[PDB]
Amino acid sequence: GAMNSSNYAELFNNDIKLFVDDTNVYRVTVHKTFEGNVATKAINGCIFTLNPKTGHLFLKIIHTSVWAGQKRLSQLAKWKTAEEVSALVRSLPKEEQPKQIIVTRKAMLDPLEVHMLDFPNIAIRPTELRLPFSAAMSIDKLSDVVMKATEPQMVLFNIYDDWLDRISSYTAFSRLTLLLRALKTNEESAKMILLSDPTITIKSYHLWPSFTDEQWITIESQMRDLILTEYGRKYNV
Amino acid sequence: MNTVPFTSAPIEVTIGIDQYSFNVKENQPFHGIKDIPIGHVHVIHFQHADNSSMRYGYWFDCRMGNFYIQYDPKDGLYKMMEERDGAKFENIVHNFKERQMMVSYPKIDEDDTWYNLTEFVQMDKIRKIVRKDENQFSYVDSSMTTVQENELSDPAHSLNYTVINFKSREAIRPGHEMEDFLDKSYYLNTVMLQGIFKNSSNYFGELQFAFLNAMFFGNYGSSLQWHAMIELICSSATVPKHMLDKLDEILYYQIKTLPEQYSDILLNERVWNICLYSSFQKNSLHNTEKIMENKYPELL
Ligand SMILES: CCNS(=O)(=O)Cc1ccc(F)cc1
Ligand SMILES: CCNS(=O)(=O)Cc1ccc(F)cc1
């Protein structure tokens, strides 16, 4: 059934699984028209499909042309997500196909189940975890590839950089979710933490800075402070 | 007007005949039911006084044979049987009528209720859902499971209702996933009406047969089937106008006949609220919506 704090280590076992987050698929700016009405303008989006054990990220870029002439876009976006995830699964060799797909929002369950009828043995699961994957577009290299896209495109990344050489998947996921939670709660501050220091480069082939083990401890502490702080500035505590 | 003669009534029992019912005391001189209208299927059903568990009964059509009830003390139930000797049977019956040992099917002349509940129900079609090929009548009880229930255990004792499953390859054309799930017209009109059922008379008949088994026996799988068949029509944007008009009449008489005190268990809140207020056909069931709103506004 649902994925929560109790069965949390299941994410790091040897059964292939993917999280799917659809938050950033349909993105708009809201603006005034010449007549003083309100209209939306779509901007490019992305499906965030992540293997939490290996860090492999399948970033399917959703170009605004997919919305042209379509109605009820927020509903369509869920079905388009499910269509693209199904197409990704079919494209993978059998031994790489997931045994479970965990959707971050329960409204993805029926669209994905329907698109995966041909795969009765792949479990489609919700989660009670409040995961911060919406903040993926605060990672500069991911935002850049999405905004520059002129056509539908899939781009592959490892969201853990080389961290798995030194830490376990559990610890790598914990770091990722801490970074993304910080970026979601106060993007400007989080990005200042990550990059204020101009002596730590981000490698061309990486997403995050090249911190030593000790520097990661300081970084992680600084992100925890930020999250608690903002939780202060928010609730006045 | 036909008759169903009883050898006797050895155990106290409430006997239903269609929408009517009456109590018979242990060893009371009861010898059956006369004046049964020809032209419709009928159901004769039983609930024992000592064990209200297991309502059970028999669907039959007197045009197909001479049928009588005799209690079996070994299996502990009232059994329907066919007598093949037409003359012995006419004789036992005329005798019981002369002794006035029978209840009369108590139909009011103005009243079309049973016709309206059984318009597309016939004995031959009933046997395609409930199987015992050696008898012309069909036994149903409260506990019998449906073929679909058995997929999610005795096959011979099952109601073969056509499996309806909205998240199934049968319901969903490859490449039309969103379209077919949000608008079930292709599943309704092509798969079910043109392919399996063959016409709306057959679809309406299974829908009606499902309701009556739910109402008379508390058969849970039949209730599921009735609601699934309603939901499949209501969730289709393209339905022939005559089917919508007939469905409104069918459901109206079903809601009208339902015991007020069984609405809680026999009516699915989600399906009815979806069908009456959210579906493509939210505005096409005027008679059903009016009776539901005036009789069961709590559910909604
Ligand atoms: C008891 C056996 N009799 S019988 O064989 O003539 C069939 C029959 C039985 C009971 C009836 F009320 C009517 C017909
Ligand atoms: C595919 C099976 N169709 S059917 O025509 O037997 C449905 C039906 C069943 C029972 C009835 F009393 C009337 C109709």
XYZ file of C-alpha atoms in Angstrom, chain A residues 2 21 27 34 58 81 92 100 102 111 124-125 127 145 162 165 167 169 171 180 183 190-191 193 196 199-200 212:
28
model
C 1.167 3.493 0.931
C 6.642 13.739 -9.056
C 3.750 25.484 -15.043
C -5.089 44.368 -22.170
C 14.977 10.606 -15.722
C 2.800 12.398 -16.942
C 13.870 0.114 -20.500
C 7.137 -0.361 -7.960
C 5.682 5.584 -6.020
C -3.786 7.967 -14.555
C 1.620 1.726 -8.281
C 1.841 3.193 -4.783
C 3.094 7.851 -0.124
C 17.881 22.525 -19.353
C 29.404 10.961 -6.820
C 31.309 6.497 -3.543
C 27.959 7.301 1.634
C 21.845 5.499 -0.487
C 22.292 8.902 3.677
C 15.469 20.254 -1.451
C 15.497 25.235 -1.241
C 19.667 27.877 0.714
C 21.469 28.929 -2.444
C 24.614 28.521 1.903
C 28.478 31.838 -0.808
C 36.509 28.363 -3.397
C 34.213 25.237 -3.787
C 34.447 17.353 1.494
